[PDB]
Amino acid sequence: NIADYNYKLPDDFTGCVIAWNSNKLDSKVSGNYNYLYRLFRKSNLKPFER
Amino acid sequence: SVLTQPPSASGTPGQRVTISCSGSSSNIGSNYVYWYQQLPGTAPKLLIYRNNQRPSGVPDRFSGSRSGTSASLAISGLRSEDEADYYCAAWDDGLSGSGWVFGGGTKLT
Amino acid sequence: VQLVQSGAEVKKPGASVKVSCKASGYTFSSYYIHWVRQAPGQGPEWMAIINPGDGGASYAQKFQGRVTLTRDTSTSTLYMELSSLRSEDTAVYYCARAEGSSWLGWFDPWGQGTLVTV
Amino acid sequence: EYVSQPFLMDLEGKQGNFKNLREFVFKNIDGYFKIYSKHTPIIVREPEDL
Numbered sequence: 001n002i003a004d005y006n007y008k009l010p011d012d013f014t015g016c017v018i019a020w021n022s023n024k025l026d027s028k029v030s031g032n033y034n035y036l037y038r039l040f041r042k043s044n045l046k047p048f049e050r
Numbered sequence: 051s052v053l054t055q056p057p058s059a060s061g062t063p064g065q066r067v068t069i070s071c072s073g074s075s076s077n078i079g080s081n082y083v084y085w086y087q088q089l090p091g092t093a094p095k096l097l098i099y100r101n102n103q104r105p106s107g108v109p110d111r112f113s114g115s116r117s118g119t120s121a122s123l124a125i126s127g128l129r130s131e132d133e134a135d136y137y138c139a140a141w142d143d144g145l146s147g148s149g150w151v152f153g154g155g156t157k158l159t
Numbered sequence: 160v161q162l163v164q165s166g167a168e169v170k171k172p173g174a175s176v177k178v179s180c181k182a183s184g185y186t187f188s189s190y191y192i193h194w195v196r197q198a199p200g201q202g203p204e205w206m207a208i209i210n211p212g213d214g215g216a217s218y219a220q221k222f223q224g225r226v227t228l229t230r231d232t233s234t235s236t237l238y239m240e241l242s243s244l245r246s247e248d249t250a251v252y253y254c255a256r257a258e259g260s261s262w263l264g265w266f267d268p269w270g271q272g273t274l275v276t277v
Numbered sequence: 278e279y280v281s282q283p284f285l286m287d288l289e290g291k292q293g294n295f296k297n298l299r300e301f302v303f304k305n306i307d308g309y310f311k312i313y314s315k316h317t318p319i320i321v322r323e324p325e326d327l
Contacts, residue, residue: 023148081263084266093270147219149204149219155202
């Protein structure tokens, strides 16, 4: 579903992805209501979306 | 995970023994450990930071170190006053909960 | 520059028990507050971490939702209202202090604790 | 933001003897917006007639 309204990838993808844990930086005891996403859109996803 | 600890630590006055906490992956090898000593009838007191320096000041007869997924504390010059319970605390970061987990329980004799 | 607890006694199981300790000393808005529970004859379990000011709260897995905490700045009181007490809920509570704006690091000295039994 | 050098124009001009032809192709696929161009001077055919 993150790859449904926001970003999936190009189908013939070249290059790659690097990810790592970020609990220390992008988290607070009070909560971060700053990173938000999309739940509703009319149509289906296709590669570039912003 | 669960931070297994020996049930007791044998000792005699005037010698050196090591007390250790053995943990799982991403609990001891990831974050630092904290050693604690509980004197009877008193509130617990901090004794070490991350095991490279002393927080305020203690004689250097106690030495802490890490090895892989475990942490160890070597104590020397044992006295009858220091007979207490030793605990270790660490940030767990496990599945469904990431609290400040503690060890088991040991008794110094 | 110290924290003292409040007095309590044995209560009926399946009820609400009010627990509190004061806070005084340094500035208040930039020091996190830890509470931790310790059972006799075993190891202590971590209870909660609280940000003053906005009163941010976070709870562990074993106590998520079943315990309620409140906090304030001017009066400087720190309440929990325990509910659903079992024989497992007979232990001593401690209120603490942290580094400040960070929940990782060494723990500043605790209080004298509050004993609760059912 | 994007600022670059301009195209190859001619200085002033007139409403007669249209000597300039400019043909472009615009498209966009896979998030990429392509622009293709071609410029032709001295077309001596005044009454339209591509």
